[model samples]
Target: TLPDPLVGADGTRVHDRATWQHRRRPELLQLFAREVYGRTPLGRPEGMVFKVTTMEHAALGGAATRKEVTVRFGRDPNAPSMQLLLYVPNAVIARAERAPVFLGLNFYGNHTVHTDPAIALSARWIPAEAPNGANHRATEAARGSDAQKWPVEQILARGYAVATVYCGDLCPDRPDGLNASVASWLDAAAGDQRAPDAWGAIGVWAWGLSRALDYLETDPLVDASRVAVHGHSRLGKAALWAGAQDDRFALVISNESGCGGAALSKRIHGETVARINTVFPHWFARNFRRYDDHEEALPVDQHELLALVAPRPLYVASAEDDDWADPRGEFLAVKAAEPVFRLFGQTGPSGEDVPRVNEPSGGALRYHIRPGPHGMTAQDWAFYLAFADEWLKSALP
Candidate 1:
């Protein structure tokens, strides 16, 4: 029977491992990712190339900057041929000591990440989805649409390399009429949305990430094994799906990924599954629409989605005020993965009891909620770094 929503039923609270793993845990993840959010495909994104264009140091006397080769996907993958921008801590004349790189997908262009003029601005013979009337600033709704949110110099100063690429360049984000992006890669359905079992925009975006890893494998300056895949909001959903589909990612972090992300669909709070399908239909497979309001009928849930990342260091962070992202559901999703991690002798759910705010719990499973809305803050980064430090110390060695 479908879970009644009008009564506003609470999630099945678990206090023991046996009942938690048996009934409530597994079903939640499978149904959520499959029936609610739709099943993300496992794209075979091999033979993609990363062409390195320019390399330089940041003008800020910190981190090294790089412009790299765009990947062109041919036939099988059906992924968009795209470009990637990489940032290293130190400039390379020949080769420097390899550094662990923070691999993240970005929105907007790389130049926007920092005010550095030397960085190659978007020259792909295309324009961002914005109208022009100004000198050089973004117009209309595309103001901060580039990778400008990150303080690149600060990251490099901390001895971490950052590799990022624009998400739209991989697959233009839109609800409809996306002719200029990956939508062109499909066969008979070659101009718009994909057919069932075919790759959707998020699936193609995740494939693009694997291709980035292919390039990282050969780049001597980057420790590809230490690569962490990250994204915010929609891209955060992409990052989680990417890591779930590909094992190359050493760490995975999703911030404020509401609706079809770390949050649970079973919980009637925040933005529901139906909202994501309605607003951004292209993000998931077409079959996702079947469970518009019938969530429990779905085969997979968010807990199973996290379990797919078993034994890997997975961190799902939510903000206190970001109820739309369902912070409690996100925490519960991570906790539900405990049984899978225990199979590999890993510690999950750090304590027998759930940790309070800023409690910093979990062994293999980790989570937190800060005092803010739906955005990644420095406090969030601090927690992620600490989690990485705990896992990397073992994974890297």
Candidate 2:
């Protein structure tokens, strides 16, 4: 039921690299932009500024140096802004010219990624779905709420820098919250008109990531070319869209991204596309609503979305107990996308079925299922580092 990524819109099978790159590739991107995630309009805006709010020489028991930067998209002091919490390993700062970074959006506040009280707590609306707050407000008790998922110490220990921005800074994760979002500066036209192909929260979040990369490119302690964009659940979908639209991302990793992130949409086995839209109406493009309960009619599927990261390493993860995320569909879609990697002379996961629990597989593109549920755990973080090392370690000076 998956769409053939190597097949052209006119029904011709793409066999050469040029055909896939120049012809078949753009077609899938256009379909996804028009029908699924919507085309994001803004880029690096003029007068964008990065101001260091906090720069610490020592953090996490002196294991790394921490920096907090406030990114202002406009010249105005009250313009749309996001706080980026970054930590560089002391060893890397001592020996390396620039360090590789794992960049992604965090659900809770940047303070939630670590217990460091020095990190600024987010002032934006924290989603009610987040455990740290109620009625969209967070308190000191919410600090380090999701620290386990971030594992900042271990990541820095491995000689890689870690950077995170709270997702709400880009677009609030609820309806009617767009007025306070970065969209006001990025896409001023998004406030009123609801075009069928208009980008929603997910698109805006993905767009914010590229803007994050823009600042990374200018930072002296960062190696912008080796940075990997990672996400979990809704953020996972944003990571995928960001990597697809911006090739500047060196690698991409998804944790239980499920339906919109990596699973085959046509499967409709768990977490149907229609169900997600009904629950989170603003997560995708307005055009996506037309596919409600009619996923069979969708021009593109999640496999094609994964294929867009071809020639670059993409790892899609799942959990055995996360039935709603459809681990099977996620595995099958990664397998289906193997052909695209093959075109690039890289082999993907072998075998006709999902690997055993906790077992990992694949080459340029990978898939794995763990013993837990939807959320990420320390064990899951181990898999992420090992897979990333295969591609980034040598490049991680």
Which candidate leads the pack in lDDT?
2
Question: What value does the lDDT take at residue 31 in candidate 2?
Answer: 93
Instruction: Specify the poorest-scoring 10-residue window by lDDT in model 1.
Output: 1-10
Across 109-210, the per-residue lDDT of candidate 1 in tens digits comes to 655555565556654322334333144334333323443347566567666677877676766676552355554544455344455444456765666677
lDDT of candidate 1 at residue 247, scale 0 to 100: 69
The digit string of per-residue lDDT tens for model 2 on 85-121 reads 8898888888856888999999988988888888887
lDDT values for all models: 0.64, 0.86
In model 1, where do residues sit more than 4 Å from their true spots?
A: 1-47, 57-59, 75-80, 91-95, 123-148, 188-193, 351-354, 394-397
